[PDB]
């Protein structure tokens, strides 16, 4: 309309779409670099996960207190520059070793095939730290200042951000796959480096624009281990604490669709009912869970939006539970009807808690409580990897669901204790 296309609400969807696309192409590239190395997805993939999770679990509160105490534009631009420079610097190494593979040049401990993995993981970890800083600042700060005082416009911005994430999580791997199989997987990596280089400048510009277009953003209000407990007791002294923990418990889940494609995904061929539809259906219930949020939130409010988005997830995971017992092939039918029909309650619950954290957390503590929620989210994602490794046998799976459904039911009791304490012990 040329009137909506220049709003600061749209130059934010755009600057977010570009960042998410860059991050996701680069994740699929690094996921195909882990095939020029140990072909297994258990040891080395889970160790990549452990490294990124540990890094953010440690530095979440320091990153948060850096987001607060400094500025709004310098923070966004520093984090943007850092992530895109680290992405091109990892893509260059990825290429310069994706060509010269299996050439041990020196015999000492700095040899190639392992210093390459160490360097890729360190630079990927810096990329992830920077992108977490950008997530904190942009979403939890600029969506709340841009959305003004409007509890139904902020709901729409949250659901919109999530829908962009959900469609990019599909379309970015397919684009980079057609590039990496069209010509070759070396020009692919060089291309993702170039893409990230140009979109760095584009997003630099878009952020500067959104800053000029809403003047409410220019208005601001053992030190490392000091500000690690000055952020983990604050996050505990908050009245909203019990919801941000009930959310963190939904991350220690093996039934998360991305991980079930690793183990217990055999006997089904690609493009028939797996990555063409079963990867494309979980992107439908991810849009169909963000449209239930904005709807339920009007009819029944933001605390009973989390209470129906909880007995929805729990009730569809009673399908993944009757599966492993099969009481009166079938079993793989249900387990995937559960993992997919329970993303309606998981993406609707993720959005209430995101919006409770947004309007109930003071502006001064807005980055600290939002770093310590990230750290809480990985601390439970870490204990997710610690459980897939040392328990990787096919026989030992019938239990990685029951102790992955129990952290769901235990994260929806820490919300039912939040609800019953906020709006009517006997009123619901």
């Amino acid at each position: 309309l040329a009137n909506y296309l220049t709003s600061a609400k749209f130059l934010l969807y755009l600057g977010h779409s570009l960042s998410t696309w860059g991050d996701r192409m680069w994740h699929f590239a690094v996921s195909v670099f882990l095939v020029e190395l140990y072909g297994n997805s258990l040891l080395l993939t889970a160790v990549y996960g452990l490294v990124v999770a540990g890094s953010v679990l440690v530095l979440g509160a320091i990153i948060g207190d850096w987001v607060d105490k400094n500025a709004r534009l310098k923070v966004a631009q520093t984090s943007l520059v850092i992530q895109n420079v680290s992405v091109i610097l990892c893509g260059i190494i990825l290429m310069m070793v994706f060509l010269h593979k299996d050439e041990l040049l020196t015999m000492y401990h700095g040899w190639v095939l392992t210093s390459c993995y160490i360097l890729i993981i360190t630079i990927a970890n810096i990329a992830n730290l920077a992108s977490t800083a950008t997530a904190i600042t942009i979403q939890r700060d600029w969506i709340v200042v841009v959305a003004g005082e409007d509890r139904s416009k902020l709901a729409n911005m949250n659901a919109t951000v999530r829908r962009i994430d959900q469609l990019t999580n599909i379309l970015a791997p397919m684009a980079v796959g057609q590039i990496m199989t069209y010509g070759s997987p070396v020009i692919g990596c060089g291309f993702i480096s170039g893409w990230n280089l140009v979109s760095m400048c584009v997003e630099y510009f878009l952020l500067w624009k959104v800053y000029q277009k809403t003047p409410a953003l220019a208005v601001k209000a053992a030190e490392p281990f000091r500000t690690f407990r000055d952020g983990w007791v604050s996050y505990y002294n908050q009245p909203i604490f019990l919801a941000g923990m009930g959310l963190a418990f939904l991350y220690m889940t093996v039934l998360g669709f991305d991980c079930i494609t690793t183990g217990y995904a055999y006997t089904q061929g690609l493009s028939g009912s797996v990555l063409s539809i079963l990867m494309g259906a979980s992107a439908i219930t991810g849009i169909m869970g963000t449209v239930a949020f904005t709807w339920l939130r009007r009819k029944c409010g933001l605390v009973r939006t989390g209470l129906i988005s909880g007995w929805a997830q729990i009730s569809c995971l009673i399908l993944c539970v009757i599966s492993v017992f099969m009481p009166g092939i079938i079993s793989v039918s249900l387990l995937f009807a559960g993992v997919i029909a329970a993303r309606i309650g998981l993406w609707s619950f993720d959005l209430t808690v995101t919006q409770l954290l947004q309007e109930n957390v003071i502006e001064s503590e807005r980055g600290i409580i939002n770093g310590v929620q990230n750290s809480m989210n990985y601390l439970l994602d870490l204990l997710h990897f610690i459980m897939v490794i040392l328990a990787p046998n096919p026989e030992a799976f019938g239990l990685l669901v029951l102790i992955s459904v129990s952290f769901v039911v235990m994260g929806h009791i820490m919300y039912f204790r939040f609800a019953q304490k906020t709006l009517g012990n006997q009123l619901f």
Partner: antibody
Amino acid sequence: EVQLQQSGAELVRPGALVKLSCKASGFNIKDYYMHWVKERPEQGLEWIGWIDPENGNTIYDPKFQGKASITADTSSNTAYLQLSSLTSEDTAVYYCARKRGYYGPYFDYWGQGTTLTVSS
Amino acid sequence: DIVMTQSQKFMSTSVGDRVSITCKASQNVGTAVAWYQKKPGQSPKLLIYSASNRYSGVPDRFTGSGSGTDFTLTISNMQSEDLADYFCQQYGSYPLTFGSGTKLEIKE
């Protein structure tokens, strides 16, 4: 300039009804939660309840759940409290207050107070 | 329910004196305590939220401190525009409860 102006100075025979009004100016009643608070003569503040004007959800203090009804009209930008079956104990100054989240750190803006006298 | 308690109903002070008003919860609120001041025949105005933050535009001699269960408002170098009532609200959980108040008074 944000204000909340209240109807004032009602005198009510006991056992009747009364409705006390709180008209907002300079913000949208709909972006907030509206709280009612009671201050008895020489007594502490007491909380009656809130109403979410968007969907009309009301939460009350269990000692007011019988005889307090908080309603709101966004079109008029105004909130209301209805006290029913009045008694001598009901005489107090009623305040209308404005809070942002379910856990907003404060009541930044307050109503001028409405003295209610229940006597015969 | 959390029952906020203010032992002193009265505090006898003098101008230029540091007066410390104390408030005590009945459960662990955390830092969920704000401080209001009301003068006779008026509406309560904010001073200090989340037990330490100083609301934007109140003089810099009002300080707030405490955590967990025992909290304190602190007036340094009291002036003559401070003789009022002070009470602590807790927003840790619903129903909200207010402190029963503490009235300052110049001391003769």
